[PDB]
Amino acid sequence: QGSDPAVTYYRLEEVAKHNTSESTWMVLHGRVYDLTRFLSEHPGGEEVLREQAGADATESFEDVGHSPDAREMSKQYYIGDVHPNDLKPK
Numbered sequence: 001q002g003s004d005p006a007v008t009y010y011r012l013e014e015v016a017k018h019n020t021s022e023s024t025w026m027v028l029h030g031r032v033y034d035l036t037r038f039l040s041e042h043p044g045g046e047e048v049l050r051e052q053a054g055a056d057a058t059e060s061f062e063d064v065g066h067s068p069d070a071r072e073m074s075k076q077y078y079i080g081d082v083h084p085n086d087l088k089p090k
């Protein structure tokens with residue numbers, strides 16, 4: 001019922017738990033990225049990620065205007081999709 005076996009799903013209330021330097025997950029465009037090993041290598045700094053860790057950071061991501069290389073760089077951190085219950089209705 002909407003459920004691709006190829007896709008692990010994470011509820012947002014779970015993603016919210018990963019908001020620490022020990023484990024930082026973040027949501028971008030309906031997708032969940034584990035950025036823990038990425039923190040120190042993010043050119044915009046750790047702080048800006050930490051401040052939005054455990055949440056949907058899509059808007060902030062897009063407003064900064066990340067580069068194509070930045071988008072390509074994010075893919076290795078993809079660990080699953082946001083549970084459909086927690087996606088916008090429209």
Ligand code: HEM
Pocket residue numbers: 033035038042043044045048049052057058060061062064065066067068069070071073074075077
């Ligand atoms: C939504 C949370 C995020 C925020 C708030 C954020 C914010 C920023 C800011 C403020 C800068 C500096 C502005 C500038 O370059 O002039 C920056 C640069 C950069 N960010 Fe992020 N970033 C986020 C997520 C990510 C992710 C997931 C990746 C990919 C793994 C990433 C990759 C980069 C790269 C490569 C740069 C260097 C410039 C470019 O290639 O765009 N960022 N980021």
Ligand SMILES: [Mg+2]
Pocket residue numbers: 068069072
């Ligand atoms: Mg490329």
